[model samples]
Target: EYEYLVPPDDYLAAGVHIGTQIKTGDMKKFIFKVRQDGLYVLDIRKLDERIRVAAKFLSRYEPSKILLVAARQYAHKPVQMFSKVVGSDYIVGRFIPGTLTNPMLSEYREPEVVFVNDPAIDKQAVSEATAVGIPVVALCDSNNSSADVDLVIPTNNKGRRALAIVYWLLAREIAKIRGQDFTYSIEDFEAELEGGSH
Candidate 1:
């Protein structure tokens, strides 16, 4: 049995109520503000639907690799888990350590797809990628503008638990979409036994 390591019940309940309000066109003005551009704003209620759609789209193409551009300080265990699921594709050196106008993402091979966690730190890369027309997938907060991102999923980027849950969900979705069985810890014998027993 998998652990329910996502938003707590109270948080989810509130999210559900908010989502219901959003769906019934009750929150049109709020939605218009967030989804003004092509940005997909997410609350706990719409997170799963967004992830599923993204997974379905990504499943159609084979990604060369996934790039994670996050500040070193902000990169936590959940980030590692996110990378692990994607096979630790590649991480931009560290946060550019300067203004978004002057980014430092020269090391990587001009990533095919980029995931930005902290908009402040990764703004440079986002701008650069946007200038060059590279695809960017970003976690947008209320404060961040979603102009440069190709796929923008709004969420609380600062929370560890929230980050972990989203990362895990996306990773699992990717694996499912790609037809890749990510039985990270299970042994082949166990898989075989399970298959044979059935």
Candidate 2:
């Protein structure tokens, strides 16, 4: 339902201006070029397209059945904010092993879909989600692989500002899809990006 793409200038100003210093195999297609600074530049168009697709796909699931897992420091707040606003479960820092597959355990929880901040850092979550046949939406950086991720939002996942804008747009889109109110506006999402505690 993206009637218009995020203006390229906004993407450039808030997000596209940054990227990883290296490009991994899975991220080659999203690369614009390697800048003189040795940073791997991502194509804003591709990033915008992927964000829209990921949001639309994630919106189809029941809010309670969706999960967002953030294993990295920069991702911690974004995932938490999105989960709270959209009413999905969130796993931050270390993802407990067997949480998804072992239903007999008291901590066991089954989610229909999973959102990950980094494919590499959240490997365990991704593996478990894959094993349980749960769809995964992931934010993949230039050096990350998109192995089991069903929906990949390629962008600068490691940057605080970049992560904020990406997740903020997703939150906005998800709210629009549900036709409901969220805890914060897009600007607030950005302000609370890294979160107050961290």
Candidate 3:
């Protein structure tokens, strides 16, 4: 079995281990160092470790009970693909209020767990999940505060490629942990760059 979900090079190339210029004290342990331009670099080892931990934790719940939320535009495609691969439900673009709490709303979802692409951009999802007493697993950037998040997976939260790689790895690892088949590639989770035709 592979030690890492994928080679560290792929994660680095995708900027999955990169972070923001502003680092929060809560995320200090996850950071490697600040670059010349002041960008915070995340420790790849920890990122990989958390990925495994998150996948293992998420695998405990049935796929249908896992709700993946991505409000950041760059994370939309990756979350959608990951949900499909793992048989989980996902909300991309906008997360409506009471989706996790109010059964009266047509968008109501009583998922046991909620996974968010970014704690900052998807705070609505995190808040509602917390209100519903649902466990929240969030992909956190160096600048993000992991306040209500139950589990934090530290990584670059802004890059399109970074989002793709993280979600792809999570989907693959979660499927493997659940004894399900994962036949998708990282590219399958990537969002199309603006202007098209790459």
Candidate 4:
């Protein structure tokens, strides 16, 4: 089982880069750059586009359980919201803590996929998972190295608002794919919100 943190609003917004115009086809390449070490400040527009792409896939598949590891404190809430919308269960912890070089923490029911928000907390866990052949999806920040990640969604992992918007959008897409009516319209959300809130 994995443990997760709750993200805040600002972290979600930070993913929204301020001044660049993103070209459609170049998004994956741009995200690749963010995953590279030393390219810390991502082009927000491009990150947003990547989120859109990932969300679409999430919407289509709607996996039952997702492992969210080492999400920054600020990004937890939005991630949780996204998880909720997609009807997926998640665990938030300080990077799925364990040793990668040895077999001490091996032999667990691998998650459908592992999502890492902060790469520092569990470098070993990430490495171990990679060594054992688990697909990884990570939000690669500028300062971190993501050579082990299979799919990387580069963004400001520390901002709350940016993360929230991205997760919400993805959740909406997932809802669409699942045939669950989750319109972005406030009225639609409100109705569901009212019911779920009780």
Candidate 3: tens digits of C-alpha lDDT, residues 1-198: 447777879889999877877999889999998899889999888999999999888888888999999888988889889878888899998888878878899999789999998887889999988887888999999999898999999999889889889988988988898788779888888898778743
**After superposing candidate 3, which stretches have Cα over 4 Å from the reference?**
none
* Candidate achieving the largest TM-score: 3
lDDT of every predicted structure (CA atoms): 0.52, 0.81, 0.88, 0.53
TM-score of each: 0.62, 0.88, 0.94, 0.62
lDDT of 1 at 161: 43
What is every candidate's alpha-carbon RMSD to the true fold? Answer: 10.6, 3.0, 1.9, 9.8
Q: Against the true structure, whose lDDT is highest?
A: 3
Residues 87-117, model 1: lDDT tens digits: 5454544645332234453443545566777
Distance from true position, residue 140, model 2, in Å? 0.5
User: What TM-score quantifies how close candidate 4 is to the native fold?
Assistant: 0.62
Predicted candidate 1: what Cα RMSD to the true structure?
10.6
Could you tell me the lDDT of residue 195 within candidate 1?
44
Question: lDDT value for candidate 2?
Answer: 0.81
TM-score of the candidate numbered 2? Answer: 0.88
Regions of model 2 farther than 4 Å from truth: 1-4, 182-187, 190-198
Q: Clash totals for all models, in order?
A: 0, 0, 0, 27
Ranking by lDDT: 3, 2, 4, 1
